[model samples]
Target: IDEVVWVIGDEAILKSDVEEARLAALYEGRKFDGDPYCVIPEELAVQKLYMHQAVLDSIEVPEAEVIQRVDYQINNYIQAMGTREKLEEYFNKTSTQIREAMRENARDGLIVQRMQQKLVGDIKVTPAEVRRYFKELPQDSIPYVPTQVEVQIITQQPKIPVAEIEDVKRRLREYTDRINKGESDFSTLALLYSEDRGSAIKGGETGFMGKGQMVPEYANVAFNLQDTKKISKIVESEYGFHIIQLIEKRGDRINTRHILLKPKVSDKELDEANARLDSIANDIRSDKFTFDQAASALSQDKDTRNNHGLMQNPQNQTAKFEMQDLPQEIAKVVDKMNIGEISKAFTMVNPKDGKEVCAIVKLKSRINGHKATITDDYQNLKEIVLDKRREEALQKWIVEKQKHTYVRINPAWQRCDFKYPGWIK
Candidate 1:
């Protein structure tokens, strides 16, 4: 059913593989800069070179780390499709089948990353280099800085009722007793009820991880576990409460299964938060207090509360956010808001703890799209220069390696000009 489209080293890129990638890009709404067939295969060919070198250099990565990557990607797919069922239906494959493919791809991707790190080493661009690269670029080649906004917000976390907390703990205790009595297993219970979505799908098995990889509370409990069958007491962490079961231990790393449950906030508590935020917004509008003053005094978000509630984009560590880069809920509100407008109180999911928080946002500032300038976008320009240098280094290695590496592309597929033309030989 599949044909070998290209051979690199001891491996092959199947025709089906390229078709699958093309279809995946389509499903993801990704736009290609050129003919996808040519772009896709060329990209794959470069990856094969790195994959080949990784094997030769005896590079090894943790299986658990690979699982982490696979789970993250699968979660993204499920989120985008709205459910696992929808994802399966669209792809015409079972969840396990999809996961297996993603696992292989994730492993290869991690290996390529390790290989690239070795080949490119550390890429550092000085201020002068950044300026030179910016000045030398063609006039039209300069990147267009997208319209960005600085949004300031004041948030209040709705308090969970004591009964809700008790209910979660009681349920977890019941689960522990059930497992102890052999009435049920931890994995099955986790798969059905655990709120930790990423691990829940894997039957709550966190493959293997070191103490440093886990939260302090989870790590302290997980590493001290001596019994494989006994369930640990409910341990509370930043995410929620968890009951853990030991799977295996090797050196400093431990593999464990867990069931997590988060306490839910009742509607009454949420309404209280909403009402409070609404009153605060009204006070701000009437000039009783400024948004910055109110945020510093009352905002529950510790990260932004002191900084006048200016939400910084984690990618660039800047207060500016492109519309698409903002959280969906915030983006929708900001889309219709004008500069200096204060939005009505709204409920937003707190990304840190996955809890609902009531918030009111102020459109602090907005800048329309413009061409990048050295003074205004030195960091962005520096990043671009660094990437260009790294790409040049990697391509230089690929071109040199191609001379000795055995490569054969299908006769009909070799017509288009590839990014690195040396692949033709």
Candidate 2:
């Protein structure tokens, strides 16, 4: 039997909720500072306060955003736990059940985040304030800036032979025909033939997704799907060519299964691409043309070509890439190269199109790890000060909210000290 351990306003935190949090923390290898029984309920109560206020404020997180976050989290869990089966076994729940639970968690988390932003509003920090914030910090409190690197790359996709594409299309056509004729099951065919490893294991089901969640080309066909028995004609997207089967449709969201097949680039084509990149690298090394000039002229990557092949951090829109921020292939090569060194040509999957591409990289700059200075890291310092101010605002808001909000904690569970001690009153 479950019991309500804490109630914040109209929201109740149950013993079961605390158990679930503890279980999630244990599975995710999260460590808490004190007794989880006390901490978890209090944390849940605080979340409840924010969520309750969020409802009153009419803050609504987009369904698409919540689903995207949940999918990202689920993918990370699958990667960490090695297999979906392992994750399901560890959680003692089916994948759908796990996903449903994650949906609630993601929605609550996003709502709380939005509510926090609303409570604090926008905090603007000036250069002077940042400088003062940094100057007043104790020597031990000064933040360390990790070694960062700037890399420029030029990539050329290996062209798949026309015959190779024809072969893939022919095979996909055969599978479609077989499924349509009731000669093979769609899921079994997907398991046997689909090239998308992530979805192939689950019979190519992409789960419930909205229009904005999928590529435009894929979404166009997926949302228009009306027949469950019939498969859609082969559609081409950046990921691959896919034949989709609609599982269900709910309002604007759709669940679909697809068998994706990518045309294989022959060794000859890969070698040609590598050789072209190698020649270009040699030309840059010999000063025939600058790396930026070559990248602008010859590189095929659209995102970086106009920017002199300088990769921008998608998160921050910055040119500086921390070592871990770089793509695995680029990170490996950049780690060994000295400043201004051009790396030899190498093959890597282009994340944009999910196609094999050959590339050479130039290490333009390297900043060795050191403590951030006011002069050199003013923007970073400003961000830090702004974050601190926002946190203070939220802390103040919580204390004030606690004064009026009806918070009731079961006496047995109220014995431990809490970060926000005003909860007890």
Candidate 3:
């Protein structure tokens, strides 16, 4: 059991491989719902098949994406866990060594993902097929669907005084002038003046990005600058006014830093905005107009407003929200709402502008906590059906591959059942 459990071609699967894979799943808080030893080994065995095939197909993972993702994961880990000093002490390795190993894992993950995509490139599930898949499931095996709701919202953004915009622009121009004259450094000025906290703290450095990675307006100015030594003139974006400095740009990738300065709004202006939404809510409660009608006509929040104020669940993008899937402000207001009830106007911060906005939401519909159904939860069922199809396809592929390729499993490890056949005796 502690020795060779599987071998495919030139690759060996040792006992340590299964233990490490299971330990990784444990760290990620993922549940296997079965003995991880037996399950993970089968998965690793299949991975070996695809990986070998990938080499024969001349498939490779992009280094840039792997390293970029590794650094992003490292950033997430440091924030969630602790600083490098604490991390290194606990792991008994330098932060650099930890990051290098993270890079390896990230690279391996990308390769696996690429191979999986290649294997299941043509699978799709239709709605009728999804319904049949649901009917075929044993009634008791259906997952417990959570209580969910569909809500529509109307928003009123507070008006910023024109004077405030001019004042911000004035200050930004002053900063740019100083930098242009060589009297001040752009990074130093950004650290002191830029209001975009995430980038500001890093001296306004936004890092490398491609077109569409950044807002089009920002990327256009950031990408078009011919001289790294020159500063771009005033550029307006949704967040605020910006003055950017180009650090570098090659054809495929561009790097730049920008200083953002947002205009201000007063407390009274916000109160008036909230009062407007409050009035709008009262009108809907009086049945003067439908929620969707008012939302389309009056809401200032573009993303939901255009869609009849219906907020798409970003997690599922299916116009649904489970209890925990809503913003804190909206969640608090909607918790007490019954189906077809309208919430009172509430204050929430606009994520883009950091300004206060007012909103009124109507709980359009609700599904009680119950077993999943084909009628009410078609999207969820469709996803499940598609996954089942993909699994069946993969199992078919693996069985076929096993006959064509050399596969040997240890007698000790072959005691349990398998979903696929044709492993070498």
Candidate 4:
């Protein structure tokens, strides 16, 4: 039971530590091609050096932020493994125990990210430089442009009838009353009633979520809650009705549990939404109303409603759409549509609300893939050149930083192709 296997400055790297890290990476499906003992020890040592430098450079990251980031990464890992329960079974530890094990790695990851940002933040490329970079790129080296789509959708959500909304609210109220009266435990109620499967088994606990992590309406109410034990009023979000209980607040993150309820939308409500959209489409066709005006005023998609009903491609965060990449419902309408033509009302399932809604789509822009051109993709080319410049700057920073930093390899990893060359001694 040797506690310490290696040391870098004041940081100690243990043998079990490297084994745990290697096992975690293997479990997460990372290709472990290199020798774990040699590679893991050297990498951890470099991370410790970077962490020291980050502290010296006054780089600070909030603990809550780190925790949230780690939680997100762990969740993704669990998802990759098919389920959290499967992951726990594989690791022989619960999610909480696994998270505590990775806290050091999470802290090191933040330090490395901060250091990379510091190295690249000031590197900039002008338009002319971008053009030059594109021109200079080898023909085969140019990045392949993926098929993308740009669309504008005028959407209407299936309206939950007043009676249904009240029913959901009353159910939430009953749950809250039961908790308050000691008739039921909040965790048990959440496990049984909460719609969020990821957190339900964990007693409805969303560890630490940042601002952009949660739906806007839910986040607003959750962040505003002051009492630890008092349940929040039933709030409606993209997910559904939620009664949130604040668990803890630390810096920019909040840990909360919510019991969610979805209101059932009637067939008549869907028909009404479709009929209304059909009428709106007719008005747009007749030039009595503009698409932007209709979208701004009537669209129920919060993400795009204010952006003139423009739908962003989730993969790239772009408003651009390719015909092939468009949703089946939207693509069918736009395929035969002419420029500036509005399509007929069509039914689409809203992922947020889990309800069928009516939508009218407008084809905004179409671009075919070709070699990088200044006229068509100035911004994209600019980012490519900027990234190259940043990499060059970081390379220079690493060269300089290596001079001041003391690095010693364990002699075992001396044969590996490290990105930086001067760490041999």
What TM-score does model 2 achieve against the real structure? 0.63
Candidate-wise lDDT, in order: 0.79, 0.79, 0.75, 0.72
Q: How well does candidate 2 score on lDDT at residue 353?
A: 49
Native RMSD of candidate 3 (Å):
10.5
Question: Which residues of candidate 4, in runs, are more than 4 Å off?
Answer: 1-8, 12-49, 59-87, 90-130, 137-141, 159-272, 313-318, 321-339, 353-355, 399-422
Q: Tens-digit lDDT track for model 4 on 102-221?
A: 675576666657656565344444445556755674566666565455678888777669998898899999999999999999999999989877788899998786555578888887
lDDT of 4: 0.72
User: Candidate 2 residues 60-124, lDDT tens each?
Assistant: 64433666676766665444524544455533455565665675577577655665556543455
**Per-model C-alpha RMSD:** 10.3, 7.8, 10.5, 9.6
Candidates 2 and 4 compared: the better one by lDDT is: 2
Instruction: Report the C-alpha lDDT of model 1 over 178-285, residue by residue, as the tens digit.
Output: 988989877899999999887898999877866465889998988778977868988999879999988898888888889999888888888888888889988999
Model 4: how far residue 259 lies from native, Å: 17
Q: For candidate 1, what is the TM-score?
A: 0.57
Determine which window of 10 residues in candidate 3 has minimal summed lDDT.
Answer: 83-92
- Which of 3 and 4 is ahead in TM-score? 4
